[PDB]
C-alpha cells in the first residue's frame, strides 16, 4: 500500500469512525475482549479523574478471564491514574 | 601437544613459535616471534624484531578466526560483508548451555517457535565485526587488544532471531581514534534478515600502545538532537547568519530540532584535519510531530572544534530521550544474582568462534602479561544478560532490546561475580536498567552496562464522561512542566477564541459565567459564537440563537456548576487525560507497540494523546463544539429540561438468568411497543453494566419492567423455551403496556426513580450513542473531515493499536474492516471506497 | 526606536556568535600605572 493512499484511507476511516461512534451503540464488550484476551495485556492503564473503566475491567477479568489468567499465568495489573500513580510512574 | 617451539632459524635469529591447536579447522597454527641474538652486548643479548610484529600477529589471529584468505588490504572506511549463516536449534542449544542461559524461549518445545538469544548476534557477526581491526591503516598489537565495550540494539518493530532464520551480517567502522591509552576502534554490525535489518551490534576495541598515524583516524559521532525555540527575531537573525543553516522558511515562534551527525578527521591529537557536520532540521508542528523543514550542512578543513555543536549546546536544549525517574528501584540486587565464570573457556570459544588464545591458552595469556586465561568478556556480557532476561523480564523474549555493556575490569575462570541491577530510568517506553557486576572476592566493577526491556503488554484506556471533578489534573498542572504546557495552550486558545478560561472553570466550577463582547476581541469572540452552527438532516439552526450583532454578552447557566455542563465537561476531561498522557510521554512510559481505546469522549482523548491526529487547540475546539452541539441536540423545556436521559442497568441484579440478550430483547420490545426511542447505548462489562438511553418515558418504562421481572422472577429465556416467540412477545407486551399506561401519568420532565437493577446517570440529558443523533452524525462527519488534517493522521500509530468505539476491533485498513464499518453505519462513502478498493491498491 | 534596537541587537548577537564560531574553529597587555613620586626641584 502506498503511503499516500494509506493516509487517505486512514483519514476517511477515522473520520467515519468518529462520526458514527457517537450515535452507534458503544461495543465495549469487544474492546475488553481485545485488550484482555486477544492481546493478553498484562498491564492495563486507565487515565482519568476517577477509575470508572478500571473497576469494570477488573470485574470483567474476574467474571470472564479468571481461569484464563490462571492457566496462561497472566498477572494482569489494572492501574488508574487517579489512585495507582506510583505504579504508573514506577515510584514505589 | 607442543605449545611452544624455540629454534635458531638462522644465525642471530631465534624463532619463538607459539603454537595454538584450539583452531577452527583443528590444524595447529604457529605465531612466530623472531628475535635478533646479539653476542656483541651481553647485557641485552636479545633484540625483538618489531618488524612485521603486528603483521605476523595479525596473520596468526587471522588463521585462528577466519574462512577468508589472508588479505589485510581492506579499506577502514569500507563495509565488511559477513558470511550468510542459517540459525539452527543445535547451535542455539550449544550457545545457551555455554553461557548458562536457561530461558524457555531458547529451548526447543512442541508448539512453540524456538527463539535465539540476542547474544547469538555476536556469534553471527563475529567474522564481520572482528575483521574491522585487521586493516593496515588500523595497526596495533592484537595481543594487547582489549575489548572495551559491546552492545546490542534491536530495530523498532523487528522480531527476535529464531530457528531457521537465514541471516547475513554487514559491519562498518564508525570511528578510529588515537587516545593516550591507545588506539580506539568502533565497529557497528547490522544484522540483515530477508534483506531487512534486525539489529545492530556495537563493539569497541582498544589497541594499547603509541600511534602517530593520525591520517588513518576518523570519528563519526551521532550528535544528540538539540531543541531550540525562537522567542524573538534575534534568534532568527543569528541562525540565518550561519552558513550551515539551509531552511528557507519563516520561524517566528516555532521550535526546531537538529538531528545532526558529525564526521571528523584528525591531523594530530588536538587538531582536526576536517569536520563534516550534517543533519535534519525538523520543526515541531502543532500536532507535536517533527517534520524536516531544513538541513544542517557544515564542512571545514583544519579546525579545532565543531562550531555547530558548540552553538547548539550553548543556545538549545538536548532532548535527552533517556529519562531518569526519582529513585532507583533495586531489581534483584543480591546473592541470587550471582554469576559464576566457567571452569574453562573452550566451550564458549568453540560456540562463538572467538578463538582468542588469551582465553584458552595459558602460554599466550602469560606472553600478553594479562593475569592467566581470563574468561571471555563476551561470556561475561551474555551471562549477565541472561540474568537480565531472567529477572528483569519473565523469560519473555519480547523484552530483549538494546543492551549496552562495558568490560571495565577483568574476570578469571571459576570467579563468582555479584551482579547488581536496578531500574533507574526510562527511554520511549523501554525500562532503562543499569547492570553492574563486581567480583565477589575483590568487589571491583568488572561489567557496567544498561539494559532496555519492554514493559508488559500495555493498553492506554481513556475515560469517558461522568467522572469529572473540580480541580482535576491540578496537582499535575503544578508539578509537571509538560502538563503546564498542555493546559496553558488549551486554556489560552479558549480565552482568545471563546472568551473563557477552561482552567478557571475546572478550578472554580462557577455556577454562572458571562462572556462579554466588548472591543474588537469581543466582536471576534461573538463572531465565533455566531458562526457556531448545528447542521442536521438539511437544517442549519444556530447553537446560540440569542447571540447576534447587537448582543453585548452571553451567560452560561448551570444548576450547581458549569464544570458539569457538557460543553465544559468534555474539553476539561479530554484535557486532563491529554495532559496526564503527555506528562507520561515526557517521562517515557509509552511502549512503542501499545494498544489504546477510550469510552465515548475517551476515544477522542486517546486518539489525540497517542496518534496525535489533532493539536491541543483543535482538540479542545472540536470537543467544545460538539459539547454545545449535544446541549442543543435535545429540545429542552423552559428550564433547560428535556425528555431524554441515561440509566445504567444490571441484568444480574434483575436475576441470574437475565442476560445481555434478555435485556436487549426487553429494550427493543419496549421501544417498538411504545413507539418511543429506547436503546442500549453502552455494552459495558457483560451481565453487570449496560447503559441505556432514550425518551425519559421509555427509560422509566424499562426501569419498572425490569423491576417487575426482578420481583416476579420470570425469565425471558425460559419463556422462549416454554412457548413460541410470538407468545413471548405477547407476555412482554402485556408488561410493557401496563408500565406504559403508568408512564403516561408521569409528567414531563420525569425524575427517574432508582430501581433494583437500574440506576439513573444524573446530570445527563442527551441520549448519545443512540439512533437519535444519526441526523447530526453526517454534518459531524464533515466537521471531523475539516478539523482532522489528513497529513496529521499517521496510520502507523493506529494499525493494530487503535480499537475504535464503533467497531471495537483493532484498527486496520482492509476491505473486511471497511465492510464491517459499512455494516454498522450504512455509509455510501464506505461503499465507494470498498468498490474502488481494488483500484486503490 | 524598535527598528534601531532590532538592528543593533541583531548585529551584536551575530558578532558575538561569529566570534564564538571563530574561537571554536581556531581554538594586548596594558601597563598598570603606579606612582612616579618625585620632588621636582626647580
Amino acid at each position: 500500500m502506498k503511503p499516500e493512499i494509506e493516509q487517505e484511507l486512514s483519514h476517511t476511516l477515522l473520520t467515519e469512525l468518529l462520526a458514527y461512534q457517537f450515535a452507534s451503540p458503544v461495543r465495549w464488550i469487544e474492546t475488553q475482549d481485545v485488550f484482555l484476551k486477544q492481546h493478553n495485556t498484562e498491564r492495563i492503564i486507565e487515565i482519568g479523574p476517577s477509575p470508572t473503566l478500571a473497576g469494570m475491567a477488573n470485574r470483567t477479568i474476574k467474571a470472564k478471564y479468571e481461569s484464563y489468567d490462571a492457566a496462561l499465568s497472566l498477572q494482569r495489573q489494572v492501574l488508574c491514574y487517579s489512585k495507582d500513580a506510583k505504579e504508573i510512574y514506577y515510584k514505589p | 601437544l607442543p605449545v611452544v617451539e624455540i629454534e635458531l632459524v638462522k644465525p642471530n635469529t631465534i624463532q619463538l613459535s607459539l603454537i595454538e591447536h584450539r583452531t577452527a579447522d583443528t590444524n595447529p597454527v604457529a605465531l612466530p616471534f623472531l628475535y635478533k641474538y646479539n653476542p656483541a652486548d651481553g647485557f641485552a643479548p636479545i633484540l625483538e624484531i618489531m618488524e612485521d610484529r603486528n603483521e605476523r600477529i595479525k596473520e596468526f589471529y587471522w588463521k585462528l578466526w577466519f574462512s577468508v584468505p589472508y588479505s589485510n588490504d581492506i579499506n577502514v572506511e569500507k563495509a565488511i560483508l559477513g558470511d550468510e549463516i542459517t540459525i539452527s536449534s543445535q547451535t542455539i542449544s550449544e550457545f545457551t548451555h555455554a553461557i548458562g542461559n536457561k530461558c524457555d524461549a531458547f529451548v526447543d518445545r512442541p508448539g512453540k517457535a524456538t527463539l535465539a538469544p540476542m547474544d547469538f548476534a555476536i556469534v553471527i557477526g563475529w567474522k564481520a565485526i572482528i575483521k574491522a581491526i585487521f586493516p593496515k591503516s588500523v595497526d596495533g598489537d592484537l595481543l594487547k587488544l582489549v575489548h572495551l565495550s559491546n552492545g546490542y540494539k534491536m530495530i523498532t518493530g523487528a522480531a527476535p532471531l529464531k530457528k531457521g532464520d537465514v541471516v547475513s551480517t554487514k559491519a562498518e567502522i564508525k570511528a578510529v581514534l588515537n587516545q593516550p591509552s591507545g588506539k580506539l576502534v568502533e565497529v557497528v554490525g547490522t544484522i540483515y534478515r530477508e534483506g531487512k535489518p534486525v539489529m545492530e551490534v556495537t563493539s569497541q576495541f582498544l589497541y594499547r600502545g603509541e600511534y602517530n598515524d593520525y591520517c588513518n583516524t576518523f570519528q563519526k559521532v551521532t550528535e544528540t538532537p538539540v531543541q531550540v525555540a525562537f522567542k524573538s527575531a534575534k534568534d532568527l537573525a543569528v541562525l540565518r547568519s550561519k552558513e550551515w543553516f539551509h531552511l528557507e522558511k519563516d520561524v517566528q515562534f516555532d521550535v526546531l530540532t537538529f538531528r545532526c551527525e558529525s564526521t571528523y578527521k584528525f591531523k594530530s591529537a588536538n587538531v582536526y584535519s576536517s569536520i563534516k557536520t550534517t543533519g535534519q532540521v525538523l520543526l515541531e508542528l502543532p500536532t507535536k510531530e517533527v517534520i524536516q523543514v531544513g538541513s544542517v550542512d557544515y564542512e571545514a578543513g583544519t579546525s579545532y572544534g565543531n562550531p555547530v555543536t558548540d552553538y547548539l549546546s550553548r543556545n538549545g536544549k538536548t532532548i535527552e530521550e533517556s529519562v531518569i525517574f526519582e529513585n532507583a528501584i533495586p531489581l534483584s540486587s543480591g546473592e541470587e544474582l550471582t554469576s559464576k565464570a566457567p571452569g574453562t573457556n573452550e566451550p564458549y570459544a568453540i560456540v562463538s568462534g572467538d578463538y582468542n588464545p588469551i582465553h584458552v591458552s595459558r602460554v599466550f595469556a602469560a606472553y600478553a602479561k594479562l593475569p592467566g586465561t581470563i574468561t571471555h568478556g563476551m561470556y561475561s556480557s551474555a551471562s549477565i544478560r541472561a540474568l537480565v532476561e531472567e529477572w528483569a523480564a519473565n523469560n519473555v523474549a519480547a523484552r530483549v532490546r538494546a543492551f549496552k555493556c562495558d568490560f571495565v575490569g577483568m574476570v578469571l575462570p571459576n570467579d563468582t561475580l555479584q551482579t547488581t541491577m536496578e531500574h533507574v530510568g526510562m527511554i520511549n517506553g523501554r525500562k532503562i536498567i543499569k547492570v553492574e557486576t563486581r567480583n565477589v572476592e575483590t568487589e571491583l566493577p568488572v561489567l557496567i552496562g544498561e539494559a532496555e526491556i519492554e514493559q508488559p503488554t500495555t493498553t492506554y484506556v481513556f475515560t469517558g464522561q461522568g467522572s469529572q471533578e473540580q480541580g482535576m489534573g491540578m496537582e499535575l498542572y503544578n508539578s509537571s512542566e509538560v502538563a503546564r504546557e498542555v493546559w496553558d495552550k488549551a486554556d489560552r486558545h479558549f480565552v482568545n477564541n471563546y472568551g473563557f478560561s477552561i482552567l478557571d472553570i475546572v478550578q472554580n466550577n462557577p455556577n454562572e459565567l458571562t462572556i462579554h463582547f466588548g472591543g474588537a476581541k469581543g466582536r471576534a469572540i461573538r463572531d465565533n459564537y455566531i458562526g457556531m452552527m448545528f447542521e442536521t438532516i438539511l437544517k442549519s439552526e444556530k447553537i446560540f440563537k440569542d447571540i447576534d450583532e447587537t448582543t453585548t454578552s452571553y451567560t452560561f447557566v448551570s444548576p450547581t456548576g458549569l464544570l458539569s455542563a457538557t460543553q465544559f465537561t468534555q474539553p476539561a476531561l479530554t484535557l486532563m487525560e491529554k495532559a496526564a498522557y503527555e506528562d507520561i510521554k515526557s517521562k517515557g512510559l509509552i511502549p512503542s507497540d501499545i494498544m489504546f481505546a477510550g469510552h465515548s469522549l475517551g476515544e477522542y482523548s486517546a486518539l489525540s494523546s497517542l496518534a496525535n491526529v489533532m493539536p491541543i487547540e483543535s482538540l479542545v475546539d472540536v470537543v467544545f463544539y460538539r459539547g454545545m452541539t449535544m446541549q442543543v441536540a435535545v429540545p429542552r423545556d423552559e428550564l433547560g429540561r428535556s425528555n431524554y436521559g441515561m440509566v445504567a442497568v444490571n441484568p444480574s441484579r434483575v436475576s441470574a438468568t437475565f442476560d445481555d440478550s434478555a435485556l436487549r430483547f426487553v429494550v427493543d420490545e419496549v421501544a417498538n411497543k411504545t413507539k418511543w426511542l429506547l436503546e442500549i447505548v453502552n455494552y459495558n462489562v457483560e451481565n453487570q453494566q449496560y447503559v441505556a438511553a432514550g425518551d425519559l418515558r421509555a427509560l422509566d418504562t424499562l426501569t419498572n419492567v425490569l423491576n417487575v421481572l426482578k420481583i416476579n422472577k420470570i425469565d425471558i429465556v425460559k419463556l422462549q423455551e416454554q412457548m413460541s416467540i410470538e407468545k413471548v412477545k405477547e407476555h412482554l407486551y402485556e408488561i410493557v403496556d401496563e408500565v406504559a399506561a403508568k408512564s403516561l401519568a408521569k409528567p414531563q420532565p420525569i425524575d427517574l426513580e432508582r430501581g433494583f437493577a437500574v440506576i439513573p446517570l444524573k446530570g445527563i440529558s442527551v441520549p448519545f450513542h443512540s439512533s437519535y443523533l444519526m441526523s447530526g452524525v453526517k454534518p459531524f462527519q464533515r466537521f471531523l473531515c475539516k478539523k482532522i488534517p489528513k497529513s496529521s493522521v499517521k496510520p502507523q500509530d493506529l494499525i493494530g493499536k487503535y480499537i475504535p468505539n464503533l467497531t471495537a476491533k483493532p484498527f486496520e485498513l482492509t476491505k473486511e474492516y471497511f465492510q464491517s464499518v459499512y455494516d454498522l453505519t450504512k455509509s455510501e462513502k464506505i461503499k465507494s471506497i470498498l468498490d474502488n478498493w481494488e483500484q486503490y491498491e | 526606536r524598535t527598528d534601531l534596537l532590532e538592528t543593533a541587537d541583531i548585529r551584536r548577537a551575530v558578532s558575538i556568535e561569529s566570534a564564538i564560531e571563530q574561537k571554536v574553529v581556531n581554538g594586548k597587555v596594558m601597563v598598570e600605572p603606579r606612582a612616579n613620586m618625585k620632588f621636582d626641584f626647580p
Side-chain angles (χ1 to χ4, degrees), chain B residues 579-592 594 596-633:
Chain B
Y581 195 93
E582 285 295 329
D583 161 69
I584 270 175
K585 288 253 296 294
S586 82
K587 308 231 185 308
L589 315 148
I590 305 301
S592 323
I594 42 56
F596 67 98
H599 205 82
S600 293
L601 182 77
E603 191 188 13
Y604 304 92
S605 187
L607 283 147
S608 50
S609 308
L610 288 106
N612 298 152
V613 296
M614 272 171 336
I616 306 312
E617 292 90 331
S618 304
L619 173 67
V620 300
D621 209 310
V622 297
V623 299
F624 181 77
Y625 204 120
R626 303 308 304 185
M628 279 319 322
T629 309
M630 281 325 89
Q631 283 265 316
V632 291

Side-chain angles (χ1 to χ4, degrees), chain B residues 49-50 53-54 56-58 60-73:
Chain B
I49 286 144
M50 305 315 279
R53 242 200 114 261
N54 291 356
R56 281 193 300 279
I57 294 156
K58 272 172 176 188
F60 147 85
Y61 267 91
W62 187 288
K63 267 184 287 253
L64 220 53
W65 281 325
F66 317 144
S67 311
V68 171
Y70 188 53
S71 176
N72 276 0
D73 221 305

Side-chain angles (χ1 to χ4, degrees), chain B residues 476-538 540 542-544 546-548 550:
Chain B
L476 194 74
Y477 178 85
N478 318 44
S479 52
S480 91
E481 304 197 345
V482 181
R484 272 118 74 155
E485 175 59 2
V486 152
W487 269 114
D488 292 327
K489 199 190 298 192
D491 190 38
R492 290 28 168 181
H493 178 78
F494 266 125
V495 202
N496 294 340
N497 173 282
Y498 291 119
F500 66 90
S501 163
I502 193 73
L503 282 167
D504 168 273
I505 289 160
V506 171
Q507 289 169 351
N508 296 313
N509 187 21
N511 176 230
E512 294 308 63
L513 178 66
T514 310
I515 317 308
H516 293 102
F517 310 130
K521 192 182 182 180
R523 314 318 183 197
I525 291 156
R526 208 175 54 199
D527 291 341
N528 301 322
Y529 278 100
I530 279 145
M532 296 192 54
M533 74 218 107
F534 178 119
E535 274 158 341
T536 158
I537 168 157
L538 185 100
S540 287
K542 275 194 187 310
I543 292 173
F544 309 91
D546 51 285
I547 300 178
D548 48 275
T550 83

Side-chain angles (χ1 to χ4, degrees), chain B residues 219-223 225-252 254-258 260-282:
Chain B
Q219 208 162 4
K220 292 156 201 177
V221 178
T222 296
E223 304 289 358
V226 278
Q227 200 171 66
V228 79
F230 313 139
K231 310 186 261 294
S232 34
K234 209 209 307 308
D235 306 345
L236 202 149
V238 165
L239 272 150
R240 290 285 183 74
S241 87
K242 305 299 192 189
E243 73 302 335
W244 51 261
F245 192 69
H246 305 40
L247 179 96
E248 283 270 44
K249 101 175 288 204
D250 159 49
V251 293
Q252 184 52 228
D254 283 0
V255 169
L256 323 188
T257 297
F258 310 88
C260 278
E261 58 77 355
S262 198
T263 303
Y264 298 100
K265 258 320 212 166
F266 299 78
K267 72 176 278 146
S268 68
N270 300 329
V271 180
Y272 284 83
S273 146
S274 80
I275 302 201
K276 179 188 193 303
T277 310
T278 176
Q280 312 327 66
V281 183
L282 320 185

Side-chain angles (χ1 to χ4, degrees), chain B residues 73-74 76-77 79-84:
Chain B
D73 221 305
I74 316 135
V76 191
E77 303 245 55
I80 303 114
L81 286 322
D83 263 355
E84 219 206 3

Side-chain angles (χ1 to χ4, degrees), chain A residues 7-8 11 16 18-23 26-27 29-30 43 45-47 49-50 60 64 75 81 89, chain B residues 455 459 461 463 467 476 583 603-604 681 683 685-686 769-770 777 780-781 788 790-791 805 807-808 827:
Chain A
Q7 224 180 20
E8 292 279 336
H11 180 255
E16 286 268 314
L18 301 206
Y20 281 102
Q21 69 95 36
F22 211 71
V26 158
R27 304 154 65 191
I29 58 104
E30 236 292 322
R43 207 135 156 281
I45 299 326
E46 191 232 32
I47 296 160
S50 80
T60 302
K64 197 190 316 263
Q75 45 264 24
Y81 193 89
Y89 290 103
Chain B
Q455 302 168 70
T459 88
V461 194
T463 313
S467 59
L476 194 74
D583 161 69
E603 191 188 13
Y604 304 92
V681 291
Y683 295 96
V685 47
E686 276 198 348
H769 303 277
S770 304
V777 152
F780 181 40
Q781 198 212 306
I788 295 154
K790 171 169 66 184
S791 96
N805 219 313
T807 50
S827 208

Side-chain angles (χ1 to χ4, degrees), chain A residues 6-21, chain B residues 596 603-604 606-608 611-614 780-781 784-785 787-790 792-793 795 798 802-806 811-813 817-818 821 830 833:
Chain A
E6 202 167 7
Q7 224 180 20
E8 292 279 336
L9 297 161
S10 77
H11 180 255
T12 55
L13 194 62
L14 184 67
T15 44
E16 286 268 314
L17 287 166
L18 301 206
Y20 281 102
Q21 69 95 36
Chain B
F596 67 98
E603 191 188 13
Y604 304 92
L607 283 147
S608 50
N612 298 152
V613 296
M614 272 171 336
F780 181 40
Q781 198 212 306
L784 289 158
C785 283
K787 268 282 194 168
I788 295 154
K790 171 169 66 184
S792 303
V793 174
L798 303 172
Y802 171 44
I803 308 154
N805 219 313
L806 181 55
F811 182 91
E812 298 298 318
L813 307 171
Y817 208 88
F818 278 89
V821 169
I830 292 284
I833 297 162

